[PDB]
Amino acid sequence: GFFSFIGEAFQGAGDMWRAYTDMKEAGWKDGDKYFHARGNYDAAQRGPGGVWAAEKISDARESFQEFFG
Amino acid sequence: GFFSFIGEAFQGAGDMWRAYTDMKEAGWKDGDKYFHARGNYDAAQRGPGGVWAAEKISDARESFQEFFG
Amino acid sequence: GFFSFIGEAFQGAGDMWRAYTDMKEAGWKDGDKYFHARGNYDAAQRGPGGVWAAEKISDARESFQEFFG
Amino acid sequence: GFFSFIGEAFQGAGDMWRAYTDMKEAGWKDGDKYFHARGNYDAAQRGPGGVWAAEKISDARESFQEFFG
Amino acid sequence: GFFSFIGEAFQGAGDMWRAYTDMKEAGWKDGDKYFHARGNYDAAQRGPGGVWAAEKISDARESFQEFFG
Amino acid sequence: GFFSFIGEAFQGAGDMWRAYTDMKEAGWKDGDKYFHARGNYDAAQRGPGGVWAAEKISDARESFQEFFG
Amino acid sequence: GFFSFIGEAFQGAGDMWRAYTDMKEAGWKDGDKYFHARGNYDAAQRGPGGVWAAEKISDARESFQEFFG
Amino acid sequence: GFFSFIGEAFQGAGDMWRAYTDMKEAGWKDGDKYFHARGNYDAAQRGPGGVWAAEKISDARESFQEFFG
Amino acid sequence: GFFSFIGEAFQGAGDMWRAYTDMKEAGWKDGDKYFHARGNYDAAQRGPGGVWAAEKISDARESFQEFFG
Amino acid sequence: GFFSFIGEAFQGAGDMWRAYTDMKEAGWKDGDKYFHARGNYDAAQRGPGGVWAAEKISDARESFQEFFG
Amino acid sequence: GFFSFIGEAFQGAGDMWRAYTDMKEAGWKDGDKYFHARGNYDAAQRGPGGVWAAEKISDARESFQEFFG
Amino acid sequence: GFFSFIGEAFQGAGDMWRAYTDMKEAGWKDGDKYFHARGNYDAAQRGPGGVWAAEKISDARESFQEFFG
């Protein structure tokens, strides 16, 4: 079992990035979730970059290189 | 079992990025979710970049290279 | 069992980054979650960078290199 | 069982970064969570950097290098 | 069982960075959590840096190097 | 059982960095938690640095090096 | 510089399997060489087998297999 | 510089399997070499087998296998 | 400089398996060499087997296997 | 400088398996060498086996295996 | 400088297995060498076995295994 | 400087297994060497076994194993 959450440069209001594994006889309730935004400037901004999602990376030679100038 | 969530440069209101695995006799309730936006400037912005989603990457030689100038 | 949460440069209001594993005969309640933003400047900002999510990285030779200039 | 939470450069209001493992006959309640922001300047800001999430890293030779100039 | 919480450069209001393991016949209640911010300057700021989350790192030779200039 | 909490450069209001292990027939209540901030300058600030979270690091030769200039 | 001599199942009389490299201002003399054979039985005999002479063998997968029954 | 001599199952009389490298201002003399054989039985005999002569063998997976039955 | 001599199951009379390196202002003499054989039985005999002569063998996985039945 | 001599199951008469390195202003003489054999039985006999001659063997995993039945 | 001589199961008469290094202004003489054999039985016999001659063996995992049954 | 001589299960007559290093202004004489054998039984016999000649053996894990049954 592999669980990997990556969260970056965001504005949230609730109930995020959750992992529920292997429950038995459970029960739950969540409530209302409000996002209210007025007059903001430069919210939720991210620079460059690549996103790799792999399971096995075998024998990688001179690979996975990112250059920023 | 492989679970990989990547979230970046966003504005949300609720109930995101969840992984529910291997439940038995469960039960749940979620509520209303409101997004209200007025008069914003430059929200949810992302720069360049590539997105790789693989399962196996074998013997990668001089590969997976991104250059930014 | 592998659980890895990485959270970075964000504004939240509640109920984030949770991992519930291996529960039996449980029960829970969560409440309302409000995000209210007015007149902000430069909220939730992130610089460059790459995101790798792998399970096995075997024999990586001269790999996984990021240069910033 | 592996649990790794990394949280960085954020503004929160409640109920974050929790790990609940191996409970039996439990029960719990959480309350309302409010985020109220007005007139701020430069909140939740992060510099550059890469995020690696792996389970096994075997025989890594001259790898995992980040340069900042 | 491995539990590692790292928290850095943040502003919180409550109920963070908790690990509940191996409970039986429990029960608990938490209260309301308010974040109120006005007129701040340079809150929740982080410099550069990389984030590695692994379980096993075997035979790493000349690896895991970060240079800052 | 391994439990490691590292907290650094933050402003909190309550109920943080807790580890509850191996309880039987327990019960508890927590109260309201308020964060109120006005007119501050340079709160919750962190310099550079990398974050490694591993379980086993075997045979690391000339590794895990960070240089600051 | 690569020099590989393999000699097998033979009858010789002299001056075999020599490698002279990188000489300067040299000089040499060899003598007479006589092979005299009478009435022999089953001299210089070899069983089956393949002869590979390569310089580079890269990425050979399930190759170079000889079966004898 | 690589020099590899393998000699097997032979009858010789003289001056075999020599490697002369990197000589300056030398000089030498060798004599007569006689092989005289009469009435022998089963001289210089070799069983099965393969002969590989390579310089580089890279990444050989499930290769170079000889079976004798 | 690499020098490897392997000699096996032989009958010789003289001046074998020599390596002369890095000589300056030398001089030498060798004499006569006689092999005389009469009426022998089963001289210079070798069983099965493979002969590998390589310089570099890199990353050999489940390779170089010989089975005798 | 590497010098490896392996000699096995042989009948010799003289001047074998020698390594002369790094001589200056030398001089030498060797004499006659006689091999005389009559009426022998089962001389110079070797069983099975493989001969590997390499310079570098890197990262050999489950390799170089010989089975005798 | 590496010098390794291995000699096994042989019949010799003289001047074997010698290593002369780093001589200056030398001089030497050797004499006659006679091998005389009559009527012998089972001389110079060797059982099974492999011969490895390497210079570097790095990171050998579950390798170099010989089984005799 | 490394010098390793291993000699096993042999019949010799003279001048074997010598190492002469680092001589200056020397001089020597050796005499005749006779091997005379008649009517012997089971001379110079060796059982099974492998011969490894390496210079560096680094990080050998579960390697170099010989089983005799």
Residue numbers in the entry:
A (entry chain I), B (entry chain K), C (entry chain G), D (entry chain E), E (entry chain C), F (entry chain A), ...: 1 to 69
Structure paper excerpt:
The disease arises in mice and humans from the misfolding of the acute phase protein serum amyloid A1 (SAA1). To investigate the molecular basis of the systemic AA amyloidosis, we here use electron cryo-microscopy (cryo-EM) and determined the structures of AA amyloid fibrils from a patient and from a diseased mouse. The human fibril encloses a clearly discernible cavity that contains many charged and polar amino acid residues, making it likely that the vacant space in the cavity is filled with water. Both fibril proteins adopt all-beta folds and differ sharply from the known globular conformations of SAA family members. The murine and the human fibril possess in-register, parallel cross-β sheets and adopt highly similar β-arch conformations at the protein N-termini.
Corresponding to previous observations, mass spectrometry (MS) shows that the mouse fibril proteins are N-terminal fragments of murine mSAA1.1 protein with mSAA1.1(1–76), mSAA1.1(1–82), and mSAA1.1(1–83) being particularly abundant. The ordered part of the density of the mouse fibril corresponds to residues 1–69 of mSAA1.1, the ordered part of the human fibril to hSAA1.1 residues 2–55. The dominant morphology of the mouse shows a width of 11.8 ± 0.5 nm and a cross-over distance of 75.7 ± 1.3 nm. Platinum side shadowing and TEM demonstrate the left-hand twist of the mouse fibril and its underlying cross-β sheets. The fold of the murine protein is compact and shows a high degree of complementarity. In the murine fibril they wrap around the N-terminal β-arch such that the resulting protein fold superficially resembles the Greek key topology, similar to α-synuclein fibrils. Another substantial difference between the human and the murine fibril protein concerns the packing interface between the two protein stacks. This interface is extremely small in the murine fibril. Two residues (Asp59 and Arg61) make bidentate, reciprocal salt bridges with the respective residues in the opposing protein stack. Each human fibril protein interacts with ten other protein molecules. The non-planarity of the murine fibril protein originates from the tilt of the protein stacks with respect to the fibril axis and a GPGG motif (residues 47–50) that induces a ~5.5 Å height change of the polypeptide chain relative to the fibril axis.
